[model samples]
Target: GRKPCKLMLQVVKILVVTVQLILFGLSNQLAVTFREENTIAFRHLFLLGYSDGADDTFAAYTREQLYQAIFHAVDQYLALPDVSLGRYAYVRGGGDPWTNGSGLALCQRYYHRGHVDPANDTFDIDPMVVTDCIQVDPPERSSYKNLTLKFHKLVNVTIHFRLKTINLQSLINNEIPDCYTFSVLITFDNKAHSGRIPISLETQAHIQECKHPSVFQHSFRLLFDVVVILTCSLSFLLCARSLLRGFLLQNEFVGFMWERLEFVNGWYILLVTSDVLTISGTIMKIGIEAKNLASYDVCSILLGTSTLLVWVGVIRYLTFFHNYNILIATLRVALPSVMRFCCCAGVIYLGYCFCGWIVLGPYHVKFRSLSMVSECLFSLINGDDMFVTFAAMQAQQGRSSLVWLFSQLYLYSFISLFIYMVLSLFIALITGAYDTIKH
Candidate 1:
């Protein structure tokens, strides 16, 4: 008798798991095969971007919460009959109880009925008490825009589900094995743009796991290129330095040798080295593909600015103050600072990006995923993440939180601006002050 009770309990447990899967339109097919395995695993995957660095750089720049809200709004666009657009009911599965075939499963085509069945006490996931039934036409053309266009009008609502399954263990104290029941995996994608949507609470409820392999691959490629460039340049520098030693030293000792040494094309070597560095930076910045426009722009701008600044500094030193040995000494001394400036600028750019994400937050309401929330505010140019997040929060929650958070972001931008300004002024001050002291 005890064994029978234990078996019955195991059956109830399986039934519960099955019910959970069905809530998300999945099957607990593994319940029947529960005896075959003790544990189960599931896999889900999606694309990130077209190519490597192209994808993640864009994703890092996105505002996730705004997209979540956008998706929530889209969920409300379920079609309804022409006779009743706003007046709608929840969906339900109602069938004759007398027939074993009688079922409580959704059967209506999405376009024709255009209304959801209200839930009854039996299916309380939806308090509407109607059950899941909607008289709608067939599912509409499955275009993304057509699907999400009405998101701006949708309200945030929660949906819940009940689950059941079959018996897994026989009549005994032995535990029922874990069923290979289908687990829910809520999925959303990045707006075919630079940023990604964060996994939302609504989606998470049904999700078991998620993955975006493209993101990691893109990051790896970007890092790999940068390392290779640096390594090759360092190697070249070491070899060239070895070649210069005997020639330069012997030229100083012998007259003919010295003249020939002057013609040894050391300057040309320097020019080539500089050019190589510049080109390498450009190549890295431009990135691997056109779809990686954001990576290309950010990397190019950062590297290009540094290259220009260093080239100008180097040229100024060589042309204006050239005592052969002194010129060499001056350049060697200045190189570190020039490189430091470039490094600082890159760091600042990254800081600005991260700060922007924290400040902007998310967009509250949008007609579609592609629609910008503050489209009217800046019709000419889109603001960065900070502005988008601020705009979204302001529109959705009200002005207070948005203003408070964005005010902080504005302050952060100001700080960066101030830093660059002060750094420029300091450099000028030192140059002028030192020149006066020297004179």
Candidate 2:
């Protein structure tokens, strides 16, 4: 039996990690907010993606047509106003109150329809229409045409916008150091059979806080995280000690055959891995908090993954309950047969995937790639969406009788073989093992 001290530490670890998550979330509210706002703002300007498709005009264009469409769309969107008077009405005919924030300034200048005041202080007219978001880069020799070089063409229109730090922390909260730089990448490509203008609207929202922080007085979160990392090391140390003790005894008893298919358990390894992720992610976050690191994405990945693994670790503790052990015990008894079955079934599955991909490649959209081919076949075998796939095969205009006959025979044979026998046996294997174990 393990010590109660270690169990107490597990409880402490979860509480500390949960609070750390809340702290992390509260700090980066701006990142999430900016992402959502930027998406909606762009969607307003380009109506295709989120549109009701029945009436949405398909976008296919020459360079000139695309350029005009974008300009027309911008004006069309800006013309719509909010129902009530707000802080700034999406202003046109504006006076330049913003300067040197150039990534942010061009929209303001372009919207200034009236003459500027002599001092360059304000506008002469008390125009009602109000604000802006950004400017675009000239078309670059852009980027994604190497593989499908002849059929595909790529052009980039990069839009730059500067978001003020006022929104970094909320209106009244202590502001983080510097302005944020946001770049919206509008990519156009002609890949569709008829027409395709999937404007790849990717925005890299970068915050620029190069100012190294001061020796701050009130950051209990840092010291709290510091202690949390330290507490986590205790559990880490204990788990390691327990694991090492097993290894040492195994070395001592190398000749003996202990019954239950031995070695250090995977659950212990998972616990240790979760501990390390928490430690590294917390330390990385503290570095960012102190203005030393700028790896938000990786740090979030580590923290989120560790939190998930730690939560799942509760299932291990719950094994003490006979109720909980029902699921655990069945998996243990049934796992060997299930693993063996999946192995050769995967070989047969991949065999069918390659066969379908090669034979039906030109004939159907579903067989375009290995990924899609596998997905289409799996759905077919699982008793879903059989009609459209069969119809697509027969719809081919240039006819070849042999090709059509081979495809028909190949698909039906796979569906009947795998679905009827393979999946049926898979179900019987589990329930049969389940009943045997129950007795």
Candidate 3:
């Protein structure tokens, strides 16, 4: 009888899932068709920054060939149907990307060719076109330093293809009836590079909505706080009981509290107090307030305090257990020596940090600031890609034997001393302590 009942339940579950899948498939297809009927979408493509010069060799296309590629793509873009033709165009190619072929020169060529006519009646698209548009001067060196290009929902357009039409009412509610995906393709020197842009009405909605936290989200956070408060209270109670019962009691609650101050016991007790305060503040804000002011900051503080306490409290609890004492005991024995090692390491670190700024700062921006250099060094210790740093350094003005020698020496020395020797010493100390405790 039980076996038959189990089989029947399994069959029923499968049937429910099958029905749900069919409904979902129909709903998705309906949505796609609805969007296609209602909305217009398109992409505008162009380049800003200069590419690495290694590929710009003898085999690469000449300047005119590049221009032809741009012109060809533009023609294809203009050929697409449902394009919302508007009259507004602006281009800034004074500096960067193209040193020889100026952006102003290209725009003027397009303008003179009757593609852009200020006198055309169709070109009246609000402030997008100022009849008093004046041509700007180009920059001296196009080292790809500062390149500016602005496209007003219409102008500076490489492609002006729109997909469909929509009712104005659908847009009034800020609800996009149709979502779209766009792609860009550029063919230069007979090589084509293409990819999806990954932006749409849905993405814009998410971006706009993310700035404000909803009431429902706040309510959920308050519910989560209840669970956190209860669990944290229980843990602290256990910790407090152990502290009092073990030795700190010395007869009274105050006696235990005061005496524990002499040890590391106070550190975790302070954390527990911090957790309680943060939780209480959160409760007051959610329960009584009509509006949230600095609510995100309050939530961040509570979460940070809660997480820090939980982890630190783990070590506090470990001190009470004999089996876990090995780790704590090891820490107790090794921390002082580690502190001294850190001091020596700190000096060496500062020296290299300065050297990083002095030697590599000019070529690479990462090593330009004290904080950035420290961040990079810390990341290197944690196994961040070092080759990226090497590549950036290689892009410098000049490279020689001395530069190569110092770069290799710095990298090897850092790995050998910090990663190998210093880190291993801490591991060895902990292992020795574990062996002793086991025996």
> Candidate 2: where are CA atoms >4 Å away?
1-3, 18-30, 46-58, 67-178, 190-199, 209-224, 255-265, 288-296, 321-327, 359-363, 379-411
Displacement of the residue 340 alpha carbon in candidate 3, Å: 1.7
For residues 11-129, write the lDDT of model 3, one tens digit per residue: 33223323433433353345444443332232222221223332233122333444444454344333433233422112233333223333322221112212324466444223333
- Residue 19 lDDT, candidate 1, scale 0-100: 35
Give the C-alpha miss distance for residue 70 in model 1, angstroms: 25
Put down candidate 1 lDDT per residue, 1-439, tens digits, no spaces: 2455422332332233233223212212232234223211111111222233342232222334444433332233333222222222232313231123211121111122123333542321222222222122223322322222212122222222111222334212232322122222222333242334332211111111122213222244345444545543553465366458756766667755434335454543543354465445546443422223323344444444434433443453355455653545544555556566667665754554454444443433331222242332223122335455445455545457655666555545645564546457547645654454345
Please identify model 3 stretches exceeding 4 Å from their true place: 1-264, 267-271, 284-291, 294-298, 395-402, 435-439
Model 1 stretches astray by more than 4 angstroms: 1-268, 274-353, 361-398, 402-413, 416-421, 436-439
User: What's the TM for model 3?
Assistant: 0.44
Angstrom error of the Cα, residue 86, model 3: value is 20
Candidate 2 lands at a TM-score of 0.65
Residue 394 of model 1, lDDT score: 51
Residue range with the least summed lDDT across 10 consecutive positions in model 3:
199-208
Q: Estimate the Cα RMSD of every predicted model relative to the unseen true structure.
A: 25.6, 13.2, 16.5
